Every structure is written in structure tokens, then in C-alpha cells.
Amino acid sequence: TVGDEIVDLTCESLEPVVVDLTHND
Amino acid sequence: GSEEKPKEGVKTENDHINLKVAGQDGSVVQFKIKRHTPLSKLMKAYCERQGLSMRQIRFRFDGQPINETDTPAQLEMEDEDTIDVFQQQT
Amino acid sequence: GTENDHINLKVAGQDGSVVQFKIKRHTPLSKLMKAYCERQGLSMRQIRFRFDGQPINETDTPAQLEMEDEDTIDVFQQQTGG
């Protein structure tokens, strides 16, 4: 095959509720 | 060089999968497509790939014609699944 | 305790290095992992976060995974589902 694949589909994910990030590591 | 789409991660559509199209039973191609989307969106890839009218080729899925309009999900395709293309120049 | 507020998840990077992340339950872990990728330099696509013994999805959420603000997100680079 060797090569990307064009097609463009619907959405990918959905986020009901939001949230921030954190530090650590 | 790179490879996306859930390596065999077909859960419930809207989770893109790689679609393999076998043309002229001589080789294979691997497309990346979700599911809920009509396969006619995929049927032209191969074309843009091999130079096919898209409408002129003939595709198939495990026991299904998947008449483009058919969406992988609707039919229940999977990652790395294949869709055979057979279209002569006559 | 925790219904739809935040919760801290511990993401482990296979090497024994885990990380804490507060993520609202009904929120796609794709954010928590995004922070993990942020934390270091992973791709998030070449990475598969597994939850304390439970394959993960970018959309999978703590609630959806019955996690909590004291669970652990396990990280595995490419191996799980999508």
C-alpha cells in the first residue's frame, strides 16, 4: 500500500463534561 | 512510514478503521475509514489510487456488495477488513 | 464523593512511571492522556492508555470506566484498541 488514506469521516469523539490538566511526572 | 487508525479497534463506529480494498484480485489496498459513513466515500479512494471511475468498479464485503452507499458500520466492517474490487475494462 | 466533578487518575508509562491527573468523570480520558502526552512527548496515537486492567479509548471516561479520584490509568504504547 505505502501511502496515506483520504476519505474524511464524521466526528471522532465527544466530551460530555470538561476538565483541566495537572503537573506531576 | 506511519500507520494510524485503531489497529483492530472496531468498537462502535465513529472510531475509524482501516479498510482493505482488493482490486482485480491481484493485490490489495488499505483504506482508513470510520463506519457510519457511506462506503461510496471509500470506493473513490481506490480510484484516486488506481485511476478508477469509482462508479464503474465493483466492490464487495464479506458476503455483501456494499453498494458504496452502504456504510461499513451498517454492514459491520472492521479494522483491516477488505472490500474486493473487480472491474474489467469492458 | 465524585459524580461528575474531577478525579485524579494515575497514568503509568509501562516503565514504572505513572502520573496523576484530575479529570471530570463524564470527560473523555483523551484529555487525561493528552496531559500525559503533554507531560512528556508521546503521540497519543502511538500510545494506548490502559486503565487499571481495562483497555482505554480516547473517549472512554472514568465514569465509563468506574474509575474515581483515586484510580490509576495504565499506559501502553500501541497495543490496545481504539
Side-chain angles (χ1 to χ4, degrees):
Chain A
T1 69
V2 283
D4 217 56
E5 310 102 84
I6 184 159
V7 64
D8 65 276
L9 292 254
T10 66
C11 57
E12 56 220 85
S13 160
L14 319 78
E15 47 274 285
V17 303
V18 296
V19 59
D20 230 56
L21 315 310
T22 59
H23 302 105
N24 260 253
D25 213 55
Chain B
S2 223
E3 222 160 47
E4 315 138 44
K5 43 272 179 204
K7 181 71 72 220
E8 230 211 74
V10 53
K11 267 99 60 215
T12 75
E13 341 167 79
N14 204 92
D15 266 306
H16 312 82
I17 72 189
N18 232 145
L19 253 195
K20 206 142 48 134
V21 206
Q24 299 196 67
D25 197 84
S27 91
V28 54
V29 272
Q30 271 225 79
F31 297 3
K32 164 224 246 248
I33 189 173
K34 181 207 58 194
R35 312 216 308 162
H36 169 124
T37 283
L39 289 157
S40 217
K41 266 95 156 38
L42 192 141
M43 307 235 165
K44 180 34 106 77
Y46 215 9
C47 308
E48 318 182 67
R49 255 147 255 261
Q50 318 189 83
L52 315 142
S53 344
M54 178 218 64
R55 17 175 316 88
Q56 266 196 63
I57 41 216
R58 340 289 168 70
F59 282 36
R60 231 229 165 160
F61 182 78
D62 240 279
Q64 194 144 219
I66 67 161
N67 332 283
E68 353 161 317
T69 71
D70 305 61
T71 85
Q74 257 163 45
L75 316 201
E76 303 174 62
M77 294 217 202
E78 280 131 297
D79 240 283
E80 323 172 71
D81 270 14
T82 325
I83 290 158
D84 110 66
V85 172
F86 293 151
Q87 210 242 116
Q88 293 276 289
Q89 272 204 309
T90 175
Chain C
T2 60
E3 199 163 272
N4 77 117
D5 63 278
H6 293 52
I7 88 181
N8 226 222
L9 258 10
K10 269 141 91 70
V11 46
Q14 291 203 100
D15 290 75
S17 54
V18 24
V19 190
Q20 311 238 321
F21 287 108
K22 237 146 131 68
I23 169 190
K24 288 225 307 156
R25 304 226 297 186
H26 303 245
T27 306
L29 291 162
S30 160
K31 204 155 259 216
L32 170 148
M33 330 135 106
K34 269 275 224 218
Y36 192 47
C37 254
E38 174 229 276
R39 282 270 45 95
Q40 349 95 154
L42 286 143
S43 184
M44 214 219 157
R45 239 262 186 279
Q46 192 256 320
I47 207 295
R48 281 297 122 239
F49 286 49
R50 203 228 275 219
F51 156 64
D52 199 72
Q54 220 83 301
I56 296 201
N57 311 147
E58 259 187 279
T59 46
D60 280 11
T61 91
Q64 243 292 50
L65 289 192
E66 297 148 289
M67 278 220 229
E68 288 142 72
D69 81 293
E70 292 203 277
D71 232 308
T72 293
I73 271 310
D74 312 51
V75 144
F76 303 117
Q77 240 157 117
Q78 251 255 297
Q79 54 132 262
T80 84

